[PDB]
Design a protein around this nucleic acid. Structure first.
Lengths: 177, 89, 59
RNA sequence: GUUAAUGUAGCUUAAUACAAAGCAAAGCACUGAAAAUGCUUAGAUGGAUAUCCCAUAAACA
């Protein structure tokens, strides 16, 4: 049996939802009373304005979350996949998960694996093979080599259905937001 | 066998009431999720003006639960409050 | 300082904002349940093919 | 398509009678936290008999 491991990367939404104007003016009012009753170069807000097409770049969106989605090539197959890598039973999922972070993406992204339990598993047959979908949370992401030869795309779920048709790959939404 | 540790969130804001309002608000959001909060400790003034930091104790997280929780927390962040995640001693 | 009319206008929508959050949390809580159930569903899927691999995963 | 799930609101075989109920959950106020307490917020028969059923989602496929 051929073992293939993959990682369902999660990108945090850097920017919070904007408060309503009444909240801002109300914030000003509570700010003023707080003082009375008190007890004892930055990055661009949105870096997508210039690009408009850089799906490869990690910063495809900043207001909302994103999920890495990397075109993958196998010996006998070439399909659009979630970040995937070849792994061995000796390595645990987190160790395989860590390898995906550096092998496929070769970037200084900041990731922590808090939960070893995997979130997704789907089997594709033509030879028996299966895909492991790991889960992790990113505090921040520093993606080097934005314009890679690969077709990696950062989309949480909007493009997941578009690029991943079969239920073995279109059901990744089940554990995604 | 490993489980998410108990991680304190230090809510640092210049204004005490704003931190308290968020501390009450964020904790109430934790109530929606049933997140256990053992204590909410207060740090001393950050003497140099001064700033006020409030701990929101968080115990118990899950792989899917953790990812959504941080996203909700970010959106909840009202204004000029800096979030923080640190493992408890 | 807000006017009394402003407070009344805000009071009406604050109920909607509370309602909007309350509806979201119900969906959010159910969404986590589906995700958690899906995560359990993912746990079962590989167990059939090979339980030994989970031995590393469960750690 | 074969097997099989699964369809009053998070939960309940509460209910089809005189109410679509009870419980869980929710905003704000009250400042150690929690809980309590006051004042407030949103809801279902996705569906039938008097088992199939279409939808949904799985192993077969």
């Amino acid at each position: 049996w051929r073992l293939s491991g993959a990682l369902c990367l999660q990108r945090p939404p850097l920017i919070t939802k904007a408060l309503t104007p009444l909240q801002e003016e109300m914030a000003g009012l509570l700010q003023q009373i707080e003082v009375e009753r008190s007890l004892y170069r930055p990055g661009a807000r949105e870096t997508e304005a210039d690009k408009k097409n850089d799906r490869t770049s990690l910063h495809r969106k900043l207001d909302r979350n994103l999920v890495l989605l990397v075109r993958e090539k196998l010996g006998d197959q070439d399909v659009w996949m979630l970040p995937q890598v070849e792994w061995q039973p000796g390595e645990t999922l987190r160790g395989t998960a860590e390898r995906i972070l550096a092998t496929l993406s070769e970037n200084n992204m900041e990731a922590k694996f808090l939960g070893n339990a995997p979130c997704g598993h789907y089997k594709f047959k033509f030879l028996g093979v299966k895909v492991f979908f790991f889960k992790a949370l990113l505090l921040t992401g520093d993606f080097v080599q934005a314009g890679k030869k690969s077709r990696h795309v950062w989309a949480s779920k909007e493009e997941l259905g578009d690029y991943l048709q079969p239920k073995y790959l279109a059901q990744v939404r089940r554990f995604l937001l | 066998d490993y489980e998410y540790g108990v991680l304190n969130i230090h809510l640092t804001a210049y204004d005490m009431s704003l931190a308290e309002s968020y501390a009450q608000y964020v904790h109430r959001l934790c109530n929606r999720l049933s997140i256990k909060v053992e204590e909410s400790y207060a740090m001393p003034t950050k003497t140099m003006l001064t700033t006020h930091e409030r701990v929101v104790q968080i115990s118990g997280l899950s792989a899917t639960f953790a990812e959504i929780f941080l996203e909700v927390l970010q959106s909840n962040l009202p204004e000029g409050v800096r979030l923080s995640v640190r493992e408890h001693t | 300082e807000h006017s009394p009319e402003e407070s009344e206008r805000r009071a009406l929508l604050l109920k909607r904002w509370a309602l909007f959050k309350q509806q979201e949390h119900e969906m959010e809580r159910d969404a986590i349940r589906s995700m958690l159930e899906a995560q359990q569903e993912a746990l079962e899927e590989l167990k059939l093919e090979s339980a030994e691999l989970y031995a590393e995963a469960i750690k």
